[PDB]
Design an enzyme around this catalytic site. Structure first.
Site, PDB file in Angstrom:
ATOM      1  N   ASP A  60      35.804  41.842  53.775  1.00  0.00           N
ATOM      2  CA  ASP A  60      35.570  43.254  53.468  1.00  0.00           C
ATOM      3  C   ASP A  60      35.295  43.810  54.861  1.00  0.00           C
ATOM      4  OD1 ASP A  60      34.279  45.319  51.093  1.00  0.00           O
ATOM      5  OD2 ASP A  60      33.645  45.663  53.162  1.00  0.00           O
ATOM      6  N   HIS A  71      29.109  48.367  43.513  1.00  0.00           N
ATOM      7  CA  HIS A  71      28.371  48.007  42.307  1.00  0.00           C
ATOM      8  C   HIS A  71      27.234  48.935  41.885  1.00  0.00           C
ATOM      9  CE1 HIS A  71      29.957  44.111  44.031  1.00  0.00           C
ATOM     10  NE2 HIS A  71      30.592  44.209  42.878  1.00  0.00           N
ATOM     11  N   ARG A 115      25.404  42.467  35.720  1.00  0.00           N
ATOM     12  CA  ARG A 115      25.109  42.035  37.079  1.00  0.00           C
ATOM     13  C   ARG A 115      24.005  42.951  37.601  1.00  0.00           C
ATOM     14  NH1 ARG A 115      30.836  41.042  40.188  1.00  0.00           N
ATOM     15  NH2 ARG A 115      31.235  43.212  39.565  1.00  0.00           N
ATOM     16  N   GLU A 159      44.157  46.034  48.451  1.00  0.00           N
ATOM     17  CA  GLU A 159      43.412  46.140  47.208  1.00  0.00           C
ATOM     18  C   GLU A 159      42.818  47.521  46.963  1.00  0.00           C
ATOM     19  OE1 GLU A 159      39.672  43.893  46.981  1.00  0.00           O
ATOM     20  OE2 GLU A 159      39.863  43.868  44.791  1.00  0.00           O
ATOM     21  N   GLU A 216      40.779  33.933  42.739  1.00  0.00           N
ATOM     22  CA  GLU A 216      39.867  34.329  43.817  1.00  0.00           C
ATOM     23  C   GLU A 216      38.377  34.013  43.752  1.00  0.00           C
ATOM     24  OE1 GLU A 216      38.459  38.760  45.583  1.00  0.00           O
ATOM     25  OE2 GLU A 216      40.530  38.309  45.012  1.00  0.00           O
ATOM     26  N   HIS A 272      39.213  43.092  51.226  1.00  0.00           N
ATOM     27  CA  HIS A 272      38.553  43.478  49.990  1.00  0.00           C
ATOM     28  C   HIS A 272      38.193  44.965  50.074  1.00  0.00           C
ATOM     29  CE1 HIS A 272      34.782  44.548  48.000  1.00  0.00           C
ATOM     30  NE2 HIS A 272      35.046  43.638  47.080  1.00  0.00           N
ATOM     31  N   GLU A 278      35.683  37.602  50.888  1.00  0.00           N
ATOM     32  CA  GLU A 278      34.941  38.856  50.844  1.00  0.00           C
ATOM     33  C   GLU A 278      33.463  38.723  51.190  1.00  0.00           C
ATOM     34  OE1 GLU A 278      35.955  39.414  46.650  1.00  0.00           O
ATOM     35  OE2 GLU A 278      33.895  40.096  46.292  1.00  0.00           O
ATOM     36  N   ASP A 297      39.628  37.255  39.447  1.00  0.00           N
ATOM     37  CA  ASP A 297      38.535  37.273  40.407  1.00  0.00           C
ATOM     38  C   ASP A 297      37.398  36.541  39.706  1.00  0.00           C
ATOM     39  OD1 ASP A 297      36.050  38.232  41.769  1.00  0.00           O
ATOM     40  OD2 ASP A 297      37.529  39.367  42.929  1.00  0.00           O
TER      41      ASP A 297
HETATM   42 MG    MG Z   1      36.760  39.448  44.775  1.00  0.00          MG
END
Ligand code: MG
Ligand code: MG
Lengths: 405, 405
Positions: free
Chosen positions: A302, A33, A59, A349, A252, A329, A280, A226
């Protein structure tokens, strides 16, 4: 019998960071992110904060990018090194340099499980069984597996017991599953843009998005949603049924991680055949035991946040014992070397770091040198035939060393 | 009707730390475990790490003291301040100064619950539902209630709905239940010194410790054992039954926090009438809902770790709805102002900071000025008749400001 291969002891463990609130915004790397402006990953994605006017559009605005990338490098007595990256940045450096180093330095490069257990036990009083502290522990664990593999001269996936498939097939996460189909991916997971506070309108909008992509991509291409912990049972239920006609494969992380009871109810209210997933943001093997027992179809730890590869392998076994699947993840190579050996991870993914989901920007660009990316939506095992996790650290990034010991 | 009181806006939030791996070891204050040598609190206490020879004798050796004290101060535009302390140190400062400040500054001093929800929502992706990050959020929440109370000119307990008892009665935690009885405490909780790896010998030694204190203290002074996440269900069951003949009131935190299923089984296996407790390391209301449903008798959130006063009040309601009690972990004034108003918190805890449990050293010595301490094992409500949480920050301590904004 011949004498065994001699192994060096761990001499040093160092931690650096890039990006985050105390470095360059948009550094990317380990923190998926930590991106620049106009990125799909920050375009009105529904979250537990989007109910607030000031934090609905971005975000980044509520601080999803304050941590940045943590880089952990372990150096053996013979000068060989291993490293890994995750999300934790500067604080992760404090934890590594001022606490965890005491369990790391001095051990044999093969004492991975031991160091792991000690890190978990020593931080139990402040780790919260997940999040920041667990991401840091995960990073150390990965760097240790990397060093071991590089010292031994083998890819992590071979050390684990070999690949169970010649190639890894991927589904792509981003706003353009239609473009993803073009690239050869097997499916596309889109983020929801509206939440509970939006009600019926929100449901119609995200469901219409799914309908449009089903039209654009065909019936064989998978479509998933998601929801990034942004909903409640009722909203998630309504959204799931509204997307049922378009054969949404799974919905998800509809709820915050602690809401196990809510996941159990959501799963039982789900449209027949539609899967419910999460994981995740969970950490520690025990949390996944609780999550698994809610009945959800797939757990998605993750590798750099759940506790590391050591923990990931255990979670895979947990899922397999219940005849279920585990689909990590992101995580790039840290996931690849693991999942390619899991009979219950038939696909993986690939999270689009490309601002407009139009190109194959590497998962952890640019912190990882020689980072592999899907070719025709797949990564053949031969691509992983390199020592450890097969990559090197990009020192060209302006890494910072806030602490030392 | 008269015009309401004028309330100022919050202008600045600042964070400092003392003790921890980057300051003076043994600073005390917010971190109960940041003590010097020859302290009962570090004397062969059983933990998830005591199974390791190198970390059996001292919790300090595995790093129980690396965090130190976090101090958060909020200043209003009318120049008044509110503050609180917790366990987080330098990293806590990062979270406050580089992240949470955006939700705090600019709000009205009465926007406490709002700021709280935003802190929880913006950190959900890395908080892990407890530990370090939650400790930080809790510290901010407490500083906000302190400021609001000081601005209004009322003790927090009166703002909450008033005291439901004229005095708080305490049980003391430490190695000397006998000395605690002489001091006027109603009970004494001792730490276990042995764990599962010690087997039957361990059970015999700690059970003998309890038997000895039962002989010295008489039948009406309560006796309890604190197991600090160090056991498994079988060992805890055996120890509980081994202490039943001495009327041990409760056995606390036998298991790591994520093991809800284990707590459910332990409670079922407990001797008739003996209570099973936990909660000091849990965080967020949702985790407490899950913990409550395991059937344990008393949940013990630390006001500075569970999410703050805002969260503590909700946990109290949760327990009360189930006809159960809530007895917070330490917390000094931050607990006092809340629990004196809870019908279901009939007694409180005083965790001995005195190295040998022989004196009434303040709970958070020496960071809090004018910090009340039990007199004859009690604290009368009149002692709490001061604004906010009734204390001032000891600026004589060498406070460090690692970050600014
Ligand atoms: Mg996700
Ligand atoms: Mg305790």
């Amino acid at each position: 019998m011949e004498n065994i291969m001699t192994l060096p002891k761990i001499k040093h463990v160092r931690a650096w960071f890039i990006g985050g609130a105390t470095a360059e915004k948009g550094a990317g790397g380990g923190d998926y992110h930590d991106q620049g402006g106009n990125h799909w990953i920050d375009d009105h994605i529904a979250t537990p904060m989007s109910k607030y006017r000031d934090y609905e559009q971005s975000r980044q605005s509520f601080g999803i990018n304050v941590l940045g990338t943590l880089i952990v490098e372990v150096e053996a007595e013979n000068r060989q090194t291993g490293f890994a990256v995750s999300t934790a940045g500067e604080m992760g450096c404090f934890i590594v340099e001022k606490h965890l180093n005491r369990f790391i330095e001095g051990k044999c490069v093969s004492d991975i499980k031991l160091i792991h257990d000690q890190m978990l036990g020593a931080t139990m009083y402040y780790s919260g069984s997940g999040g920041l502290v667990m991401n840091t522990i995960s990073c150390v664990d990965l760097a240790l597996w990397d060093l071991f593999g590089k010292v031994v001269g083998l890819p992590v996936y071979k050390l684990l017991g070999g690949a169970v498939r010649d190639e890894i097939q991927f589904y792509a996460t981003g706003a353009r599953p239609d473009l993803a189909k073009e690239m050869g991916f097997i499916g596309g997971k889109m983020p929801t843009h509206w939440g509970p506070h939006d009600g019926d309108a929100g449901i119609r909008k995200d469901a219409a998005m799914v309908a449009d992509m089903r039209e654009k991509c065909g019936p064989d291409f998978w479509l998933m949603l998601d929801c990034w912990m942004s909903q409640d049972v009722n909203y998630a239920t309504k959204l799931a049924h509204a997307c049922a006609p378009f054969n949404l494969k799974w919905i998800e992380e509809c709820l915050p991680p602690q809401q196990y009871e809510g996941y159990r109810e959501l799963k039982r209210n789900a449209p027949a055949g539609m899967m419910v997933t999460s994981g995740e943001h969970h950490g520690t093997l025990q949390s996944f035991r609780t999550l698994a027992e809610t009945g959800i179809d797939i757990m998605q730890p993750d590798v750099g946040w759940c506790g590391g590869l050591t923990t990931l392998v255990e979670i895979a076994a947990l899922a397999k014992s219940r005849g279920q699947l585990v689909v990590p993840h992101g995580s790039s190579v840290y996931s690849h070397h693991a999942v390619i050996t899991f009979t219950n991870t038939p696909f993986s993914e690939f999270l689009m770091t490309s601002p407009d989901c139009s190109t194959l920007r590497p998962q952890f660009d640019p912190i990882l040198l020689d980072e592999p990316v899907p070719v025709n939506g797949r990564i053949h095992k031969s691509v992983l035939d390199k020592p450890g996790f097969g990559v090197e650290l990009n020192r060209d990034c302006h890494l910072k060393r806030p602490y030392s010991h």
